[PDB]
Amino acid sequence: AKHPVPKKKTSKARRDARRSHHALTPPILVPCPECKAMKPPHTVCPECGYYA
Amino acid sequence: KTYVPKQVEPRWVLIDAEGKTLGRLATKIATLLRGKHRPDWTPNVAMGDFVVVVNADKIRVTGKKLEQKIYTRYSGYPGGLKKIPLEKMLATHPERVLEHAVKGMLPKGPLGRRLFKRLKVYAGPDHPHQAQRPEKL
């Protein structure tokens, strides 16, 4: 408001372009040795446990 | 309805250099980079012969151009204007001085820049003896 403000509506082009790096990435997962299910590596998870 | 050529074929050519007046020669070279001599001239495709110059380190030039004529060169920074005289061009990179001319005589667009790539200048000769090479004058 006070002082600076956009000089022009951003085009739907430039807008979406800015957003080119917004996409997510799937979580890193590995099949836990004990159970069959998936776990995030280096972590314990329910429906399972650990050795000592 | 006017004719339109098909996929041509790169005619190569071999030009001398010694004794040739820089600009005078530069003209002919350009007209060869474009078609303009090939009657199937097509201004949007590029099919002008490949040109290969040799012994460019020997080009003639009138007046006192060797000291008078100086090439400018701007870098983005302040005072970035460089003033290199002809004498120093040939003394160092000499194939350079032939380029700064023909390039300056080619069209400006994206095609023009492709044409520049069809030019091969050396101080030698001893250019890479690929294939065609019909010397001219």
Partner: protein, 117 residues
């Protein structure tokens, strides 16, 4: 009797957005941006229809002069020759002969040569 705007305005707008299909961004979606674009478009074409005459007036001349010089003479002379001999043929375009049907060009060359001297 009241005559509300009704359909009239929509149809006139819609009728122009058609005309403006394929234009970049708003120039093809907004009626107002469209009309503006179309204005220039009409003038650009009208001016280019006059241009197209010259776009070939040239192309041919080069192509002619091109093959023309293979035979040792230049366009400006070639025409002096042809025009001298009264050979009003070869409306520049038809001097595509330089391309296909070369011999005939070579013929016209000698004719023009003999005419001039």
């Amino acid at each position: 009797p009241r005559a509300k705007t009704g359909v009239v305005r929509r149809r006139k707008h819609k009728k122009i957005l058609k005309l403006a299909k394929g234009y970049w961004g708003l120039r093809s979606k907004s009626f107002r941006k469209a009309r503006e674009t179309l204005f220039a478009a009409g003038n650009y074409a009208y001016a280019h229809r006059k241009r197209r005459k010259r776009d070939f007036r040239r192309l041919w001349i080069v192509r002619i002069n091109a093959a023309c010089r293979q035979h040792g003479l230049n366009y400006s002379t070639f025409i002096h020759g042809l025009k001298k001999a009264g050979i009003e043929v070869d409306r520049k375009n038809l001097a595509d002969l330089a391309v296909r049907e070369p011999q005939v060009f070579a013929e016209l060359v000698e004719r023009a040569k003999a005419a001039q001297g």
